[PDB]
Amino acid sequence: RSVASSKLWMLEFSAFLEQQQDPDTYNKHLFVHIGLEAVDIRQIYDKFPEKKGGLKDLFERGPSNAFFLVKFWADLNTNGSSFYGVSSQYESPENMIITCSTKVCSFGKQVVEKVETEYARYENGHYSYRIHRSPLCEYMINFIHKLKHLPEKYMMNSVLENFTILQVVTNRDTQETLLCIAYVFEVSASEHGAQHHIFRLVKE
């Protein structure tokens, strides 16, 4: 349990492209997937929204054990009958109503926010929360298209220098931060495909 606070654990996270070849045949490509060293959070504040409700504000309110930074190496090697989706799965000892807010940022400025409300299902002594096949926003689809149409892979990483995603999972009723994940991206250059590393965000 890497991406886990005391109240919530993200077991799975993935963004994907699914293509329907025919009514019985589906092909799925994963851009990124999850299935701990410390980073000084001050080093990344400029890359995320600030002011009230922003990254610094959220971190100061805590708990400090809810705060993570994930570095992805995205797999963009892939080709009417397409679906861009995001799937994620969470577990908690507690029966809560959770809200998941995902903010896409450019130069630390919010471009778009997607918000989802999730209810618990009882599962083997704990409660499970699943965001299943959530539609990726048009902005993200277009961003991927524009990336893939860049002549050089260094240009892709250059663009991705100033592109971040912030995911905040909250208890809707109490507003407690259950998980806060800052995402940073590079393009995968490996034979392995998509890769990741997970860090704890610390005050200093």
């Binding site: 060293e37 860049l150 100033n162």
Partner: protein, 40 residues
């Protein structure tokens, strides 16, 4: 101008001569662990 302008963001790398975006410190020059830049 707009900082969230998607075209400008991509134009800045495709056509550096006409780049009109905020100037920033590259991640590789920041105080970050080695694991941040080396994939597993």
């Amino acid at each position: 101008d707009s900082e969230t302008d998607l075209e400008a963001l991509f134009n800045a790398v495709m056509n550096p001569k006409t780049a009109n975006v905020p100037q920033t410190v590259p991640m590789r020059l920041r105080k970050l662990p080695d694991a941040f830049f080396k994939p597993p």
